[PDB]
């Protein structure tokens, strides 16, 4: 499956 870039990091 596709792995996308993170655009909003976890806290």
């Amino acid at each position: 499956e596709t792995i996308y870039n993170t655009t909003l990091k976890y806290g």
Partner: antibody, heavy 123, light 109 residues
Framework: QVQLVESGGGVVQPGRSLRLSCAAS????????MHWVRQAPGKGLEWVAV????????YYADSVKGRFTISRDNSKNTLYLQMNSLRAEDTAVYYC????????????????WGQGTLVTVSS | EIVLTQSPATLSLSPGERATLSCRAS??????LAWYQQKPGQAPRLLIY???DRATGIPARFSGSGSGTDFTLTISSLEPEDFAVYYC??????????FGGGTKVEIKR
């Protein structure tokens, strides 16, 4: 075989409350962040809220802040949207959507989407 | 928030014709721009992500291009099932995640 099935929509009076559910199957629900998006009759798409895989990080559209709460029960493969103080303008089909997998946070890719559940705010 | 503007609001074309849809962002979103299709009576479906990458199982007639503030979705030859509404969506700067207002592709006569 990834499937999302919303339920709970119905008629609710202005100022009252309603909880929506989204039942996930065909994937490891606890691994994914989840979104709610809504679509008023004849209108476009409006993002509502997101919750992290583990439930600890939550964000909301300005229009529902202080009124809506997103939550999840990973043991039951279920996503919730608690809607309080409902307004006529909250009338919409509500979709749950899976956040695309990424490392260290949210992707903001919505795939797939459920079939939606209709909320009608009316007296 | 990032405002996405889609033009034209309606595209009137015949099956087999090429369709070009536009999305413009109020500031640069890099390449973080996706396209969803919404067929009548159905939920939206991811078509293109990161401006130009086709989602799984999306036919080759769909393509996208662009970066910064200007993006296009192209359907090289419309099929009957392609007459639908298309939304762009940015994930560069959020919350909120924002969508364009949608472009309807209708049958010309």
């Amino acid at each position: 075989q990834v499937q999302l099935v919303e339920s709970g929509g119905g008629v609710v009076q202005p100022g009252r409350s309603l909880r929506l559910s989204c039942a996930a199957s065909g994937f490891t629900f606890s691994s994914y962040n989840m979104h709610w998006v809504r679509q008023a009759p004849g209108k476009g798409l409006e993002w509502v809220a997101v919750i992290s895989n583990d439930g600890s990080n939550k964000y909301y559209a300005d229009s529902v802040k202080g009124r809506f709460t997103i939550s999840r029960d990973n043991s039951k493969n279920t996503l919730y949207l608690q809607m309080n103080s409902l307004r006529a303008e909250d009338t919409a089909v509500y979709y749950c959507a899976r956040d695309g997998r990424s490392v260290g946070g949210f992707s903001g890719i919505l795939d797939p989407w459920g079939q939606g559940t209709l909320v009608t705010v009316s007296s | 928030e990032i405002v996405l503007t889609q033009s034209p609001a309606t595209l009137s074309l015949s099956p087999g014709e090429r369709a070009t849809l536009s999305c413009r962002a109020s500031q640069s979103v890099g390449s973080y721009l996706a396209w969803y299709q919404q067929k009548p009576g159905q939920a939206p479906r991811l078509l293109i992500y990161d401006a130009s990458d086709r989602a799984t199982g999306i036919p080759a007639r769909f393509s996208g291009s662009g970066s910064g503030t200007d993006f296009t979705l192209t359907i090289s030859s419309l099929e009957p099932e392609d007459f639908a509404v298309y939304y762009c969506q940015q994930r560069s700067n959020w919350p909120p995640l924002t969508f364009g207002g949608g472009t309807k592709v209708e049958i010309k006569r």
